[PDB]
């Protein structure tokens, strides 16, 4: 913990609020990188913003679609413990579609369960 041993919930930014302190999975487009390298902004499939906080300043540069894994802060930002740049080079990732999937994941937890049930 290091959260790789727990279920993590795929959310959009619309849901941050309903997820304080829970482990989550935020997929978004890189909007801004803070000068310090310690914080950055991703916009979800509905074009809304989530703030990603870091422990160590960003190691190298990132952009495009990033998938962040972290705990939702008291301030409803995300303390990130790892991220992944999405292989985009041959086909662009439809961020809007993914957003529908997220919604559907939450209308149907009996069919996309979270953790051993």
């Amino acid at each position: 913990v290091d959260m790789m041993d727990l279920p993590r919930s795929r959310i959009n930014a619309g849901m941050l609020a309903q997820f304080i302190d829970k482990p989550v999975c935020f997929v978004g487009r890189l909007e801004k990188i803070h000068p310090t390298g310690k914080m950055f902004i991703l916009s979800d499939g509905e074009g809304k913003n989530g703030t990603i906080e870091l422990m160590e300043p960003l190691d190298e540069e990132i952009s495009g679609i990033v998938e962040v894994v972290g705990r939702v802060t008291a301030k409803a930002t995300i303390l990130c413990t790892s991220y992944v740049q999405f292989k985009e080079d041959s086909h662009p990732f439809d961020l809007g579609l993914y957003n529908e999937a997220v919604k559907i994941i939450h209308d149907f937890p009996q069919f996309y369960p979270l953790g051993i049930v």
Binding site: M4, S9, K87, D94, L97, I105, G115
Partner: protein, 127 residues
Amino acid sequence: RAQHIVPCTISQLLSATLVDEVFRIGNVEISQVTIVGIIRHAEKAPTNIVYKIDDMTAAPMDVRQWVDNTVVPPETYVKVAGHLRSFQNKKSLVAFKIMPLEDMNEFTTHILEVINAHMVLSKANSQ
């Protein structure tokens, strides 16, 4: 009777239990399955290669691939087709196909296909 290749989340696999000689999550019999996750750790051996594959849904799972190309680099996304087997009360997947994800959209497709197949088959099983 008929045995489809059911798309799944790892949380579904770890939750499936044995019921009359076949694995079952919800009331969907499963055997052949595809998952899509992210290689968190490779493990080389000459016979077999063991991966730790993580989607969102639970702790990463073991995926064994029996060798005979190269070891897929930790960090990459992959689709996996295989058989769900449990040995020492521990579920693992026996992969026939492990293919680095080309178009990250396939990944969304999967989330959609899982929720869909599971919804359809569980309905079809009544009745």
